[PDB]
Design a protein around this ligand. Sequence first.
Ligand SMILES: [Zn+2]
Ligand SMILES: [Zn+2]
Lengths: 133, 321, 214, 112, 36
Amino acid sequence: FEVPRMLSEDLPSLELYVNKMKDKTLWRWWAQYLESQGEMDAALHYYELARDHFSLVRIHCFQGNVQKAAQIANETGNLAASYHLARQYESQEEVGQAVHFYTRAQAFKNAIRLCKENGLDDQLMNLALLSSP
Amino acid sequence: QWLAENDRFEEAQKAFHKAGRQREAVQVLEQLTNNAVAESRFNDAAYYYWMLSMQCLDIAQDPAQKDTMLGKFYHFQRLAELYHGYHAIHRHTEDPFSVHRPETLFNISRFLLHSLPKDTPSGISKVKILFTLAKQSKALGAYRLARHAYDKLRGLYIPARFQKSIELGTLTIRAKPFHDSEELVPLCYRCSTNNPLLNNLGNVCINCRQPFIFSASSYDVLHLVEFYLEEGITDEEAISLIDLESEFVPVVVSRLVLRSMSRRDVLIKRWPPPLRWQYFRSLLPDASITMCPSCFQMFHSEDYELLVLQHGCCPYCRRCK
Amino acid sequence: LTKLPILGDACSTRIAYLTSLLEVTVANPVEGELPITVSVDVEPNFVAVGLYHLAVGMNNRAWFYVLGENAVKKLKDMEYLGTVASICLHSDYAAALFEGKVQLHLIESEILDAQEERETRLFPAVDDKCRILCHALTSDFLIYGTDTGVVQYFYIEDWQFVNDYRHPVSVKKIFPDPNGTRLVFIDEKSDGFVYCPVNDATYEIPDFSPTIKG
Amino acid sequence: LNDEAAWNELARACLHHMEVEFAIRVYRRIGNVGIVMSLEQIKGIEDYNLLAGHLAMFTNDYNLAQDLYLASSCPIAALEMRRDLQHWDSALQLAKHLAPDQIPFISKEYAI
Amino acid sequence: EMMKMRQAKLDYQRLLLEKRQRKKRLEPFMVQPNPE
Ligand SMILES: [Zn+2]
Ligand SMILES: [Zn+2]
């Protein structure tokens, strides 16, 4: 982290450094810094390189493509992606999808919550047995 | 020592701690904290301080030095909270981007400023706290707290990289309606009252003085009130009863009251044997709170699951998941 | 040439000096640009300049122009109610100075959901008794002077006063710093000062020449 | 220039203007060590008047130091300065106004 | 009396908690630039 501070305002020098080190923290810092400058199509590249599936899924749920987020969450098992994907469907009003995907992340307290709100009775059993005491 | 000469100092401290060492463990751990505080790793500084806190309380298991180690435990716990809070402010004023929501930074900055009145643990520069607070209060709409933040700033030496923004904000904040949005006003949960955002006495009500119970994710205000047990009552006794179904005058729940609650509405925060279990009634049982069983911090349930999933541990203690 | 009155102005690092009877030149050498011209339609009297505009008017008028990167467009030909003294264009808004009044008006205005509260305002306030001797505009402020010594900052963005100093005597010339916060003003007796509104206090400028002009 | 006294003058100026970091950089080259550590000790101070008093004391102007310290958040520091600086009469004066515990002990020290 | 207003405040802060967590849940927080 210290090097980014030093090389701030030396942005090309930073870019060289971060593209060389290949540390998956400098890569994620550069990804942050190519999402906070409105160049979202290289944030995907560097986040892809820096194995940050929660972030990729987030961006994919921002740019309307949600089939892509579904893809990046089917195979990589990163639960955080399953959470944010489920919330994306939640705002999208897909209910079965946003319930099953909370289920994926082993986050059953949100699952039971949206389940109760919808009224899915089967959900109560399916996520109460699995639920903690 | 093999790890030590192999520079694996974190594991080495863990080893001495597990090895009954109480001279090597503490010395290496304090040295590690000083290194962390020296750099910008304030979150690690907080975690190491937390380890010191629980380990020193474990040492206080010895009746010889109980009095002289509960003080150390309390001091290190307060330092742990402060540094974990200050890490977010440190990140926010350095990175060209921002990670946290504005609400969370606002709440963190207010808690810090109301818990760090006149003494600054090493590294915690309160110019940054007030700067973040002023920006965030002006953004959210608490236009009277921002006036305080700037007035307080006017008495501190400002680094040159903050002067332009602060000395222009102090001027452009007089244009705002001079009003604090009600959506941010803190509310007590023991006495109904609406404490000023800037409460001079610290984190405490005015009518009563029940200190606010803050969570550990967004440093938010919580709906938990801390009742204390009666005189001739034990923790086992109290839990038994529960399951069966102007200075400060602390509330003293008594037996027939403890038989009028349920585990749905109390959080027990079972400390180790040397201390006594402190309790927390809740006033909105419909809402939820989860208590990390290691560090006994409290979070909103929904927040705690996202946080565990994101980190793979508690964020405060990095205990297993 | 027989005679060339010396007019011109500055904003950030952008000179706009007069060339000849029918011309002006605009340049930003500091940032490495070229000289342009705007061939003003008359004999100019005042030449304000700013980030994005020029301005020249001679008797009661003001030909704004747009300082683009290629050429200039005769934006408007707006006029005023008296002898226009010294207009000052920084940023978007402009602030003419005619007969002890100052009249903050937006320049590039087409009536598209723009509150008429913002289009035009006339300092000193309608009722008070002053004559604004000197004003000077900043990134966002309408710092002006008075006769009863009132240096009122005016935050344009939220359209309210932010500062009221009160000099013993009529502040008659003002020059803000590039950042805008601090200020340098000369009173009647030729006694400079450095007003820093943050801490509301004036520091006297030692050994100030009796005939300082700028 | 490579003149020791020129560097020293630069250092005094850098102390004078509350430029702690750059003054440390200078002193670290001058070599003066008993002030490098002191400045690194007070680099954390944020209070304007307290820091003012400290950097005044480092420029061996104790009267102005007292003046500022009495306006800072921690006035007893001026007391500490007097007591270290051995001027126990001003130590009594400042203490009496601020601390009563130093009173009999600083009285004893002044008597001795 | 005091009970009524106390319960009213208890309900207000209930509602605020709801809208707060709703804001977190139904909105994403894209990394945003800072002014400085
Ligand atoms: Zn209260
Ligand atoms: Zn924990």
